[PDB]
Design a protein around this ligand. Sequence first.
Ligand code: A1L5R
Ligand code: A1L5R
Ligand code: ZN
Ligand code: ZN
Lengths: 176, 175
Amino acid sequence: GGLTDEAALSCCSDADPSTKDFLLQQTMLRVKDPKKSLDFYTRVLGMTLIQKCDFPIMKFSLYFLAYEDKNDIPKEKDEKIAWALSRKATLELTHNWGTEDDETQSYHNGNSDPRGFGHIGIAVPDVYSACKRFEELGVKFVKKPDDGKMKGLAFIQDPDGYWIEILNPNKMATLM
Amino acid sequence: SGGLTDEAALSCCSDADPSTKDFLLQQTMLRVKDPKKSLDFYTRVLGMTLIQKCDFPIMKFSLYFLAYEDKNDIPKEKDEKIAWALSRKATLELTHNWGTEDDETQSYHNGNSDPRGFGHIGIAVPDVYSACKRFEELGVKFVKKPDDGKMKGLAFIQDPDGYWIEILNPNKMAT
Ligand SMILES: COc1c(/C=C/C(=O)c2ccc(O)cc2)ccc(O)c1O
Ligand SMILES: COc1c(/C=C\C(=O)c2ccc(O)cc2)ccc(O)c1O
Ligand SMILES: [Zn+2]
Ligand SMILES: [Zn+2]
């Protein structure tokens, strides 16, 4: 039966003053082909690329994506990194050079064994209109809004097969 | 490859379609073996707040939503609470499948060993070294202490499932 509400709450402590300005800054996903990933996240989901880092010795690049106004990205390089890495709710996409041409290689999405990570989730003003647009753009769906018993809630998949939940906060008060 | 030039990157980027203008990155979902340890670590050790819990007695799971929010902004009424909680940016959604906490042969995978995908979440903090001194005192397991290895000034800890959490100071990043 899992925890009651009260039991769950008893397991929680109020935050220590030392953690007062902490923020949940990023979730990192490895991506096979950064070309396909950047197109998906900016053109399909409307995020902005806010920072790109290359490491030639380790052979990887990092791409920071966020729902930010690109007008707010600062022009100087040092201040740009500090602002990008102080933004809440970024997605960090790691590209290990070479994966895009390797026909055997693919990453795992965490939704089959071995499982752990499940999905990221985008809050939208309207799941039906978002998902209609998605359909028109050729996006691959895991669960259309009306499929299954959780009506009004959908999952799509990025080019790597990672799941993305599409949810409408103003409607979710309709199941427990 | 040598990976993408900055220009080739930008060329794969589109401006945000107006249909997306109010979208927000609302959650990252992790499955947790035992919600008791997970709630303790993310509140008491990391300073997050539990803002919503949901239970699904038929499908035998619960969801716990965790976020850096003042507990006094949480609405008192339940329906409003959900709307508020599931509209916050940057929440962590922990899924408990009932019974896992008692199963000695069951563990989740953190993405950082074959087969890889997900890599970590990350917390921006004002002071990586002080934060990590406190983590150590509280018994936190480390993947990478701040001065271990090449990238000095950045850490990785693990939660009770072994998921990697980066600890970074945005103003120190970029050597
Ligand atoms: C992907 O996360 C990053 C990286 C991360 C780069 C890594 O590949 C890495 C993996 C394991 C380890 O123990 C150390 C580094 C480097 C800089 C940065 O700011 C950031 O957010
Ligand atoms: C874990 O993410 C969630 C879920 C998650 C669970 C789902 O119902 C689900 C449905 C179909 C499928 O193919 C996979 C999972 C349910 C409600 C919610 O608010 C939320 O954020
Ligand atoms: Zn990172
Ligand atoms: Zn979810």
